[PDB]
Amino acid sequence: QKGSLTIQQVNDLLDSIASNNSAKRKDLIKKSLLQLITQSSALEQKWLIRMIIKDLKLGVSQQTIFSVFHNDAAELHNVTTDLEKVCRQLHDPSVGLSDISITLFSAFKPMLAAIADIEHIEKDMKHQSFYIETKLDGERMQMHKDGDVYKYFSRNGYNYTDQFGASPTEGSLTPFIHNAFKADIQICILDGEMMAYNPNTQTFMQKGTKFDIKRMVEDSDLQTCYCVFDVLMVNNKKLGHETLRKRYEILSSIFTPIPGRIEIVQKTQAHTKNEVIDALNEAIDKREEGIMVKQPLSIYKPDKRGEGWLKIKPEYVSGLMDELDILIVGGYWGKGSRGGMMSHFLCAVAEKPPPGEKPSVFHTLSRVGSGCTMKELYDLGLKLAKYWKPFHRKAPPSSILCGTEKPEVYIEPCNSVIVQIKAAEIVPSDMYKTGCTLRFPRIEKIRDDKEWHECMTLDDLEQLRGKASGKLASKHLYI
Amino acid sequence: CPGESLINPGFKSKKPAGGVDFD
Amino acid sequence: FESQSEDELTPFDMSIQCIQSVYISKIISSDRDLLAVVFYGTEKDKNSVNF
Amino acid sequence: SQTVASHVPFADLCSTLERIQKSKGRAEKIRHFREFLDSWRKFHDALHKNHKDVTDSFYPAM
Amino acid sequence: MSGWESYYKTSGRDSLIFLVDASKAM
Ligand SMILES: *OP(=O)(O)OC[C@H]1O[C@@H](n2cnc3c(N)ncnc32)[C@H](O)[C@@H]1O
Ligand SMILES: [Mg+2]
């Protein structure tokens, strides 16, 4: 009923757990956890479990905590992304920080983009010229350079310098991009995308979900490329308060691009809606994610969305996508907010039956667990509550055929419902019987008018997959 | 179960040797 | 550690005698078996869990 | 190298978090967090009265 | 030092639902 641990002791034990996980020693993890268990109460252990899983569910926003701590703490964290500096510098509430700005070797929360409705695009650009560019499918990285020292940070602030190299002697990008920079540039901060490049075809491989640009394989032929679209510091000159025009101009005086390893994204001037629509249609033709629209006179604002940057994707425009009518063949239980109900489901397509017969066998396609309100999920659970059956791996049912992914409970197709799914594209996979799975799947409507025997068929899925190279956005926006 | 050994489980407790006990 | 009668064995002595007897019987009979000895109620401590 | 975290039981932080979670409005949650923070800061001021350079902070709790 | 023990010290509208009984006795 009483513990004997201080905060420092708990931090030390957690540090031991993390370090020993890094060193591949599980005995020490067991010892540390045993000490925590033996020297703590039930409430303390509940909170320790929450801290280890990294979810506390306090109900109070991180912004509220920072505001209580100090008047200017969220601003400092948006620039440093390090709690230690926030807590040390802002110790006395009265004493503030004179000026806070991006600093070398300190991760800053990247500027994001907001969805755009094509009709009012001009109104979003203040009736002026704007930049249109292509959206790249890869990771987001920011690079800090001081002389021969390099550092890399991800979107949320995680260090990636081990992968890309902290010095020209080692890495996957630095030994090749070190000599790209010009003579007069020694200090630099850049923001861009990390991509995979195939030299044989000289083409960017879109990282839908595969070939691990996140961790390049030595034997693979494709290499790592860095497409830069912003500069925030050059030679003790801070560019974050300057306009996008000046930063784009300065970006051409830092490095001379070498194709395949480092590049500058092209921005095209445009001042009409028709230009935006044409760019979107061209992107759909080239099988690309979408386009970005930027305001030339917009300053950089960390962690802020919908200030000067906008994005357009085929999904955001109504009607431009193909939707799939598929059956629900299994279900899964849910987490905290939705605990005692089936939250995510496993869906399957049908097998073309012999002429004049109803489908008998089904092939799993993908799990979908987003796009339904709580009331809709409750109603769906009530409808299918009677027909759920427990799933046994040793005696799988004949009607449903599954790969490596199996449901917790399965329902016979004769008593299930048809669901409409909107997905970005169809990609190969080995966890499902169809050999393919959807990308970004969501439920658009639980069709109460479609019978179970009106489900899609493997033939239709293959036709859709081959029609447009897997991308579900094929036709062009018209106006 | 009954009359089992408390030293070597799975073996029956042997009665001590009694030698010759004339009737 | 208290003896009710002058000519009698304390509980501790009886326990130790029994432990030694079982040890000798095991050595003679089954030498591959595992035995351990633990004490509780003491002032010192020696265990993996640091109880 | 004294530290306030070496003097603060983890039970205090856990109880503060429990009170924050089992509260209705934002005012009460902020109030409990502020009470903890003010106690920590006052103890910090008391502890490091003579020392000149201090790296101690609220980081262990944050 | 005094220790950590000293420092811590530990409108709207009305809704009504009639509920009549449709039994043979009523
Ligand atoms: O959908 P989303 O919020 O992830 O979109 C924003 C992300 O898109 C990536 N990206 C690709 N190309 C660009 C350009 N030119 N400018 C800004 N962002 C870009 C980034 O990863 C971004 O976080
Ligand atoms: Mg992306």
XYZ file of C-alpha atoms and ligand atoms in Angstrom:
665
model
C 0.000 0.000 0.000
C 3.039 2.315 0.179
C 6.014 2.827 -2.113
C 9.628 3.782 -1.481
C 10.752 5.258 -4.818
C 11.707 8.806 -5.777
C 11.428 10.398 -9.209
C 15.181 10.158 -9.769
C 15.155 6.429 -9.011
C 12.317 5.820 -11.468
C 14.102 7.808 -14.165
C 17.284 5.814 -13.542
C 15.435 2.497 -13.806
C 13.690 3.555 -17.017
C 17.034 4.699 -18.436
C 18.476 1.290 -17.594
C 15.564 -0.408 -19.363
C 16.039 1.686 -22.506
C 19.823 1.327 -22.617
C 19.702 -2.427 -22.051
C 17.128 -2.731 -24.824
C 19.598 -0.909 -27.069
C 22.354 -3.346 -26.030
C 20.245 -6.519 -26.463
C 20.292 -7.621 -22.813
C 16.910 -8.772 -21.509
C 18.098 -9.966 -18.094
C 18.800 -6.377 -17.056
C 15.364 -5.289 -18.296
C 13.842 -8.047 -16.177
C 15.861 -6.970 -13.135
C 14.869 -3.309 -13.474
C 11.195 -4.154 -13.946
C 11.341 -6.492 -10.950
C 12.762 -3.717 -8.775
C 10.025 -1.346 -9.945
C 7.340 -3.955 -9.222
C 8.699 -4.838 -5.787
C 9.155 -1.208 -4.674
C 5.876 0.329 -5.862
C 2.154 0.356 -5.131
C -0.655 -0.566 -7.520
C -1.447 3.053 -8.420
C 2.220 3.820 -9.049
C 2.474 0.735 -11.252
C -0.600 1.738 -13.254
C 0.938 5.139 -13.927
C 4.296 3.517 -14.734
C 2.587 1.287 -17.299
C 0.931 4.348 -18.814
C 4.275 6.169 -18.967
C 6.021 3.175 -20.554
C 3.317 2.910 -23.217
C 3.580 6.717 -23.578
C -0.144 7.428 -23.149
C -1.442 9.091 -19.982
C -4.905 10.335 -21.033
C -4.907 13.201 -18.540
C -7.534 15.120 -20.518
C -5.461 18.329 -20.435
C -3.632 19.475 -23.548
C 0.150 19.613 -23.718
C -0.332 23.259 -24.675
C -2.201 23.851 -21.415
C 0.633 22.280 -19.416
C 3.190 24.441 -21.212
C 1.083 27.569 -20.704
C 0.846 26.839 -16.980
C 4.601 26.242 -16.805
C 5.646 29.504 -18.480
C 4.108 32.182 -20.675
C 6.479 31.374 -23.564
C 7.141 27.634 -23.422
C 5.238 26.262 -26.407
C 7.094 28.804 -28.541
C 10.447 27.591 -27.215
C 9.495 23.937 -27.684
C 8.421 24.578 -31.282
C 12.018 25.677 -31.909
C 14.111 23.356 -29.691
C 11.941 20.219 -29.363
C 13.831 19.424 -26.150
C 12.085 19.454 -22.784
C 15.388 19.902 -20.947
C 16.081 23.306 -22.485
C 12.485 24.434 -21.960
C 12.601 23.484 -18.278
C 16.070 24.909 -17.598
C 15.890 28.215 -19.469
C 12.301 28.950 -18.387
C 12.721 28.229 -14.682
C 11.744 31.644 -13.301
C 8.299 32.712 -14.595
C 9.206 36.399 -14.362
C 12.369 36.028 -16.461
C 11.473 35.464 -20.109
C 13.385 34.892 -23.332
C 14.224 37.993 -25.355
C 14.090 36.354 -28.792
C 13.492 32.724 -29.768
C 14.390 31.472 -33.239
C 15.701 28.423 -35.061
C 19.188 27.503 -33.855
C 21.804 25.178 -35.292
C 21.646 21.540 -34.169
C 18.212 22.099 -32.603
C 15.214 20.402 -34.185
C 12.299 22.663 -35.088
C 8.752 21.495 -35.699
C 8.273 21.625 -39.488
C 5.723 23.875 -41.149
C 2.763 21.854 -42.415
C 0.065 22.321 -45.051
C -3.728 22.522 -44.978
C -6.326 21.090 -47.335
C -7.528 23.408 -50.099
C -10.878 23.716 -51.864
C -10.014 24.433 -55.481
C -12.843 26.942 -55.942
C -11.508 29.500 -53.436
C -7.811 28.875 -54.133
C -7.310 32.438 -55.358
C -8.965 33.829 -52.231
C -6.536 31.738 -50.180
C -3.603 33.383 -51.998
C -4.887 36.945 -51.439
C -5.511 37.402 -55.174
C -1.824 37.313 -56.090
C 0.626 35.034 -57.845
C 1.382 31.713 -56.182
C 3.721 28.750 -56.567
C 2.565 25.304 -57.698
C 4.797 22.295 -57.052
C 4.562 18.515 -57.002
C 4.066 16.546 -53.792
C 6.709 13.897 -53.125
C 6.064 10.505 -51.510
C 8.783 10.009 -48.939
C 10.049 11.003 -45.533
C 10.446 14.535 -44.206
C 13.935 15.513 -43.102
C 15.778 18.603 -41.963
C 19.551 18.894 -42.160
C 21.917 21.012 -40.065
C 25.453 21.607 -41.340
C 28.378 23.242 -39.540
C 31.638 22.784 -41.397
C 32.286 19.053 -41.587
C 29.544 18.200 -39.054
C 26.063 17.127 -40.162
C 22.874 16.352 -38.261
C 19.476 15.119 -39.429
C 16.053 15.343 -37.800
C 12.703 13.820 -38.715
C 9.204 15.311 -38.655
C 8.629 14.758 -34.927
C 12.228 15.467 -33.903
C 13.832 12.021 -33.892
C 17.521 11.866 -34.738
C 18.400 10.055 -37.974
C 22.078 11.007 -38.294
C 23.110 7.372 -37.838
C 21.441 6.411 -41.115
C 22.472 9.375 -43.289
C 25.931 10.033 -41.836
C 27.327 12.631 -39.440
C 30.541 13.110 -41.451
C 31.722 12.600 -45.045
C 33.560 9.445 -43.963
C 30.336 7.518 -43.265
C 26.655 7.503 -44.145
C 24.262 6.933 -47.017
C 23.943 10.533 -48.286
C 26.589 12.767 -46.709
C 29.690 11.291 -48.414
C 28.054 12.088 -51.758
C 26.394 15.449 -51.004
C 29.272 17.005 -49.043
C 30.938 18.406 -52.168
C 27.700 19.796 -53.624
C 27.819 22.912 -51.449
C 29.541 26.075 -52.599
C 32.770 27.519 -51.253
C 31.282 30.274 -49.097
C 28.689 28.102 -47.295
C 29.726 26.460 -44.023
C 26.660 26.853 -41.776
C 23.350 25.762 -43.265
C 19.876 24.574 -42.313
C 17.727 22.880 -44.950
C 14.276 21.294 -45.007
C 13.173 18.762 -47.578
C 12.017 15.285 -48.500
C 13.988 12.041 -48.485
C 13.192 9.704 -51.376
C 14.401 6.545 -53.092
C 15.905 6.863 -56.572
C 16.384 4.135 -59.177
C 19.386 5.006 -61.385
C 18.635 2.345 -64.005
C 15.370 4.067 -64.925
C 16.557 7.372 -63.405
C 13.195 7.642 -61.650
C 11.892 8.302 -58.159
C 10.348 5.236 -56.526
C 7.320 6.407 -54.564
C 7.489 5.074 -51.003
C 3.899 3.981 -50.776
C 4.826 1.434 -48.134
C 7.816 -0.472 -49.558
C 11.554 -0.585 -50.397
C 12.311 1.116 -47.058
C 13.668 4.555 -47.724
C 13.246 4.562 -43.938
C 16.134 2.058 -43.816
C 18.064 1.626 -47.057
C 19.249 -1.894 -47.884
C 22.854 -2.230 -49.022
C 22.102 -4.773 -51.760
C 19.305 -2.658 -53.258
C 20.134 -0.732 -56.421
C 18.097 2.357 -55.527
C 19.744 5.078 -53.439
C 18.712 7.971 -51.197
C 17.827 11.392 -52.615
C 17.168 14.709 -50.872
C 14.723 17.124 -52.512
C 15.121 20.487 -50.774
C 12.287 23.012 -50.691
C 13.342 25.499 -47.989
C 16.332 27.156 -46.336
C 16.179 28.593 -42.820
C 19.771 29.612 -42.008
C 22.943 30.318 -44.017
C 26.184 31.695 -42.540
C 24.862 33.323 -39.366
C 21.925 34.791 -41.289
C 18.455 33.729 -40.161
C 16.033 33.351 -43.071
C 12.956 32.202 -41.145
C 11.539 35.733 -40.977
C 12.032 36.340 -44.712
C 9.570 35.811 -47.541
C 9.354 32.563 -49.485
C 10.627 34.419 -52.556
C 13.905 35.394 -50.904
C 14.440 31.924 -49.438
C 13.787 30.297 -52.815
C 16.257 32.727 -54.393
C 18.895 31.994 -51.747
C 18.395 28.247 -52.146
C 20.113 28.378 -55.552
C 23.289 29.889 -54.043
C 23.991 27.120 -51.500
C 24.583 23.968 -53.550
C 24.816 23.036 -57.221
C 22.454 20.072 -57.588
C 23.778 16.691 -58.696
C 20.879 14.560 -59.994
C 20.119 11.432 -58.021
C 21.421 12.576 -54.639
C 20.383 16.196 -53.983
C 17.910 18.372 -55.862
C 15.785 21.520 -55.682
C 12.034 21.161 -56.145
C 10.725 23.191 -59.070
C 8.115 25.861 -58.335
C 5.934 27.224 -61.142
C 4.249 30.623 -61.096
C 0.471 30.596 -61.478
C -2.350 33.076 -60.883
C -5.567 31.282 -61.896
C -7.665 28.325 -60.789
C -7.410 26.689 -64.216
C -3.637 26.438 -63.785
C -4.156 24.569 -60.512
C -6.639 22.195 -62.136
C -4.284 21.546 -65.051
C -1.422 20.785 -62.667
C -3.624 18.378 -60.713
C -4.675 16.596 -63.905
C -1.050 16.329 -65.028
C -0.144 14.840 -61.652
C -2.943 12.292 -62.025
C -1.581 11.487 -65.487
C 1.905 10.892 -64.066
C 0.468 8.852 -61.154
C 1.507 11.253 -58.395
C 0.168 12.044 -54.942
C -0.964 15.593 -55.664
C 0.167 19.206 -55.742
C 1.113 21.926 -53.270
C 0.277 25.628 -53.549
C 2.407 28.189 -51.719
C 2.191 31.929 -51.108
C 5.364 33.815 -52.136
C 5.110 36.363 -49.289
C 4.662 33.808 -46.480
C 7.171 33.533 -43.635
C 8.150 30.274 -41.936
C 6.071 29.409 -38.856
C 7.017 26.168 -37.068
C 4.275 23.702 -36.125
C 1.635 25.887 -37.812
C -0.758 24.503 -40.420
C -2.786 26.418 -42.979
C -0.842 29.693 -42.963
C 0.747 29.899 -46.411
C 0.960 26.293 -47.614
C -1.896 24.296 -49.144
C -2.213 20.793 -50.594
C -4.560 19.278 -53.176
C -4.994 15.527 -53.666
C -7.411 13.635 -55.920
C -9.115 12.256 -52.805
C -10.165 15.701 -51.568
C -12.171 16.329 -54.763
C -15.535 14.572 -54.767
C -16.121 11.952 -57.443
C -12.541 11.646 -58.714
C -11.914 8.279 -57.018
C -13.098 4.704 -57.465
C -14.751 3.090 -54.441
C -14.940 -0.626 -53.682
C -18.008 -2.523 -52.446
C -16.652 -5.321 -50.248
C -18.040 -7.668 -47.614
C -17.267 -7.805 -43.893
C -15.953 -11.274 -43.033
C -14.388 -10.659 -39.627
C -14.045 -8.293 -36.714
C -11.654 -7.191 -33.993
C -12.114 -5.759 -30.523
C -11.309 -2.135 -29.765
C -9.097 -0.059 -27.498
C -9.962 2.390 -24.712
C -12.363 4.911 -26.230
C -14.251 2.067 -27.959
C -13.627 -0.961 -25.773
C -16.615 -3.278 -25.649
C -17.416 -3.157 -29.351
C -15.981 -4.252 -32.686
C -13.986 -1.262 -33.941
C -12.006 -2.623 -36.910
C -13.074 -5.225 -39.451
C -11.577 -7.598 -42.009
C -13.151 -7.500 -45.474
C -13.117 -9.898 -48.405
C -13.951 -10.042 -52.086
C -15.891 -12.860 -53.732
C -14.941 -15.629 -56.142
C -16.686 -15.620 -59.512
C -19.164 -18.484 -59.064
C -20.269 -20.836 -61.824
C -22.945 -19.210 -63.982
C -26.291 -18.946 -62.227
C -25.057 -19.550 -58.679
C -24.265 -17.495 -55.626
C -20.649 -16.958 -54.517
C -19.252 -19.664 -52.244
C -15.622 -18.751 -51.475
C -14.130 -15.418 -50.443
C -10.638 -13.915 -50.417
C -9.541 -11.392 -47.804
C -8.456 -7.954 -49.027
C -7.704 -5.562 -46.158
C -8.685 -4.335 -42.706
C -10.611 -1.078 -42.336
C -11.272 0.597 -39.003
C -11.827 4.292 -39.691
C -14.656 6.326 -41.179
C -17.601 5.365 -38.947
C -19.077 7.381 -36.094
C -19.717 5.812 -32.703
C -23.458 5.481 -33.335
C -22.894 3.769 -36.684
C -20.476 1.320 -35.066
C -22.985 0.596 -32.296
C -25.734 -0.077 -34.836
C -23.438 -2.310 -36.889
C -22.475 -4.255 -33.779
C -26.123 -4.749 -32.862
C -26.960 -5.953 -36.375
C -24.115 -8.497 -36.520
C -23.959 -9.378 -32.811
C -25.846 -12.657 -33.199
C -23.824 -13.987 -36.133
C -20.265 -13.587 -34.828
C -18.362 -16.827 -34.284
C -15.001 -17.365 -32.562
C -12.070 -17.942 -34.900
C -9.927 -21.062 -34.496
C -6.660 -21.236 -36.419
C -6.634 -25.046 -36.375
C -10.064 -25.369 -38.057
C -10.495 -22.349 -40.330
C -13.852 -22.037 -42.101
C -14.247 -23.201 -45.680
C -16.139 -20.146 -46.941
C -13.508 -17.575 -45.913
C -9.918 -17.947 -47.114
C -7.251 -15.946 -45.294
C -3.519 -15.382 -45.496
C -1.253 -14.362 -42.625
C -3.862 -11.956 -41.193
C -6.741 -13.666 -39.402
C -9.720 -12.196 -37.543
C -10.639 -12.654 -33.911
C -14.263 -13.429 -34.847
C -15.680 -14.391 -38.244
C -19.192 -14.056 -39.659
C -20.608 -16.153 -42.467
C -21.021 -14.088 -45.660
C -24.734 -14.902 -45.878
C -25.469 -12.716 -42.825
C -22.978 -9.873 -43.334
C -23.175 -6.383 -44.848
C -21.602 -4.611 -47.817
C -19.312 -1.651 -47.139
C -17.995 1.043 -49.466
C -14.263 1.706 -49.137
C -12.361 4.729 -50.443
C -8.636 4.056 -50.768
C -5.661 5.897 -52.217
C -4.440 2.890 -54.214
C -3.940 -0.886 -54.297
C -0.494 -2.213 -53.386
C 0.996 -5.734 -53.331
C 1.023 -7.540 -50.002
C 1.662 -10.977 -48.528
C -0.691 -10.815 -45.520
C -3.879 -11.284 -47.574
C -5.229 -13.915 -49.938
C -5.852 -11.536 -52.840
C -2.152 -10.676 -52.857
C -3.012 -6.982 -52.596
C -4.137 -4.532 -49.931
C -5.513 -1.011 -49.949
C -3.592 2.118 -48.977
C -5.309 4.525 -46.579
C -8.651 2.670 -46.452
C -11.747 4.193 -44.882
C -15.477 3.481 -44.807
C -17.706 5.804 -46.826
C -21.042 4.055 -46.244
C -22.458 0.782 -44.922
C -24.734 -0.062 -47.834
C -28.135 -1.277 -46.637
C -29.397 -1.634 -50.229
C -26.727 -4.044 -51.522
C -27.054 -7.770 -50.899
C -24.127 -9.956 -49.888
C -24.015 -11.652 -53.304
C -23.499 -8.303 -55.074
C -19.957 -8.066 -53.696
C -16.957 -7.320 -55.858
C -15.166 -10.227 -57.515
C -11.487 -11.020 -57.934
C -11.851 -10.315 -61.654
C -13.168 -6.805 -61.034
C -10.414 -6.148 -58.497
C -7.752 -7.263 -60.976
C -9.288 -5.063 -63.672
C -9.305 -2.054 -61.341
C -5.730 -2.767 -60.241
C -4.477 -2.960 -63.818
C -6.543 -0.074 -65.173
C -4.367 2.734 -63.770
C -1.228 1.073 -62.361
C -2.943 0.564 -58.997
C -3.818 4.204 -58.351
C -7.545 4.623 -57.744
C -7.537 8.228 -59.036
C -7.578 8.066 -62.837
C -9.987 10.540 -64.417
C -9.478 14.295 -64.635
C -11.216 17.089 -62.771
C -13.406 19.177 -65.068
C -14.937 22.630 -64.740
C -0.024 -41.923 -3.004
C -0.410 -43.526 0.440
C 2.866 -44.584 2.010
C 5.036 -42.491 -0.305
C 8.598 -41.398 0.415
C 9.171 -37.897 1.768
C 12.781 -37.958 0.516
C 12.530 -39.558 -2.953
C 9.137 -38.782 -4.529
C 7.706 -41.508 -6.721
C 9.077 -44.322 -4.541
C 7.393 -46.194 -1.713
C 8.818 -45.813 1.783
C 10.652 -49.086 2.374
C 10.046 -50.645 5.768
C 13.224 -50.944 7.872
C 15.024 -54.274 7.782
C 13.894 -56.387 10.716
C 16.083 -59.449 10.489
C 14.755 -62.608 12.106
C 11.790 -62.163 14.463
C 10.846 -65.568 15.842
C 7.152 -66.295 16.338
C 15.116 -20.864 20.057
C 13.528 -21.755 23.422
C 13.557 -25.172 25.104
C 10.485 -26.053 27.157
C 12.390 -28.695 29.143
C 16.050 -28.726 30.120
C 16.736 -32.064 28.383
C 15.107 -31.440 25.014
C 15.931 -30.058 21.581
C 14.956 -26.575 20.467
C 12.881 -26.355 17.273
C 15.869 -24.908 15.413
C 18.099 -27.838 16.361
C 15.459 -30.353 15.288
C 15.066 -28.574 11.948
C 18.819 -28.554 11.334
C 19.101 -32.240 12.229
C 16.309 -33.048 9.778
C 17.938 -30.993 7.017
C 21.265 -32.766 7.509
C 19.594 -36.184 7.536
C 17.787 -35.456 4.270
C 21.043 -34.197 2.754
C 22.878 -37.412 3.641
C 20.009 -39.585 2.414
C 19.994 -37.691 -0.885
C 23.761 -38.014 -1.305
C 23.538 -41.778 -0.885
C 20.310 -42.343 -2.837
C 19.855 -39.655 -5.529
C 22.941 -37.485 -6.025
C 21.522 -35.557 -9.006
C 18.655 -33.942 -7.080
C 18.531 -30.269 -6.119
C 18.259 -28.975 -2.552
C 18.270 -25.449 -1.144
C 18.119 -23.869 2.311
C 16.439 -20.551 3.161
C 15.766 -18.668 6.403
C 13.021 -16.159 7.174
C 12.566 -13.909 10.169
C 16.210 -12.813 10.177
C 17.816 -9.373 10.363
C 20.075 -9.720 7.320
C 18.914 -10.339 3.760
C 20.400 -12.106 0.738
C 18.220 -12.727 -2.314
C 17.852 -11.765 -5.957
C 14.859 -9.492 -5.298
C 16.635 -7.680 -2.439
C 13.729 -8.309 -0.094
C 25.067 17.821 -6.665
C 21.748 17.878 -4.823
C 18.555 17.448 -6.833
C 14.942 18.094 -5.887
C 13.903 14.890 -7.663
C 15.936 12.957 -5.087
C 13.607 14.367 -2.405
C 10.215 14.006 -4.144
C 8.385 10.667 -3.777
C 6.855 9.289 -6.957
C 3.605 8.802 -5.036
C 3.105 12.575 -4.934
C 3.345 12.855 -8.716
C 1.079 9.835 -9.168
C -1.546 11.287 -6.822
C -1.415 14.634 -8.622
C -1.929 12.865 -11.946
C -4.839 10.870 -10.517
C -6.494 14.054 -9.257
C -5.984 15.698 -12.653
C -7.563 12.728 -14.423
C -10.530 12.532 -12.027
C -11.567 16.160 -12.415
C -14.391 17.763 -14.373
C -13.179 21.097 -15.734
C -9.961 22.670 -16.950
C -9.757 24.954 -13.912
C -9.356 22.126 -11.391
C -6.779 20.257 -13.482
C -4.709 23.398 -13.977
C -5.063 24.138 -10.261
C -3.653 20.775 -9.191
C -0.782 20.987 -11.670
C -0.034 24.543 -10.535
C 0.012 23.515 -6.877
C 2.544 20.793 -7.654
C 4.655 23.182 -9.737
C 4.654 25.914 -7.087
C 5.650 23.474 -4.349
C 8.478 22.182 -6.544
C 9.727 25.695 -7.294
C 9.633 26.808 -3.657
C 11.567 23.707 -2.614
C 14.069 24.358 -5.410
C 14.592 27.898 -4.139
C 15.090 26.646 -0.584
C 17.522 23.885 -1.566
C 19.895 25.816 -3.864
C 20.147 28.943 -1.705
C 23.953 29.013 -1.578
C 24.861 27.338 -4.874
C 25.742 29.516 -7.871
C 25.547 27.332 -11.002
C 22.541 24.995 -10.997
C 21.492 22.595 -13.749
C 18.476 21.409 -11.747
C 15.043 21.957 -13.259
C 11.556 20.459 -13.542
C 12.726 18.054 -16.255
C 12.553 14.860 -14.131
C 8.834 15.420 -13.539
C 8.019 16.835 -16.975
C 15.996 22.541 4.950
C 12.397 21.815 5.967
C 11.929 18.760 3.747
C 9.458 18.129 0.955
C 6.687 17.196 3.397
C 6.231 20.808 4.508
C 6.202 22.243 0.986
C 3.716 19.838 -0.593
C 1.163 19.353 2.204
C -0.496 16.722 0.015
C -29.804 27.285 -18.165
C -31.480 24.911 -20.613
C -34.938 23.479 -21.177
C -37.029 20.812 -19.483
C -37.512 17.371 -21.034
C -40.418 15.162 -19.947
C -41.295 11.631 -21.088
C -44.689 10.286 -20.080
C -44.741 6.502 -19.691
C -48.239 5.032 -19.771
C -48.982 1.339 -19.253
C -51.034 -0.383 -21.965
C -51.946 -3.452 -19.913
C -55.382 -5.036 -19.765
C -55.777 -3.900 -16.153
C -55.400 -0.214 -17.032
O -0.638 14.957 -46.096
P 0.475 15.588 -45.300
O 0.019 16.540 -44.225
O 1.547 14.629 -44.861
O 1.215 16.522 -46.354
C 2.337 17.303 -45.974
C 3.624 16.553 -46.196
O 3.900 16.456 -47.607
C 5.282 16.280 -47.800
N 5.722 17.134 -48.919
C 6.048 16.662 -50.131
N 6.413 17.668 -50.960
C 6.324 18.811 -50.269
C 6.564 20.236 -50.553
N 6.985 20.638 -51.772
N 6.349 21.115 -49.558
C 5.933 20.725 -48.341
N 5.695 19.444 -48.022
C 5.870 18.456 -48.925
C 5.993 16.605 -46.481
O 6.469 15.391 -45.920
C 4.871 17.205 -45.634
O 5.019 16.982 -44.244
Mg 4.513 12.148 -47.603
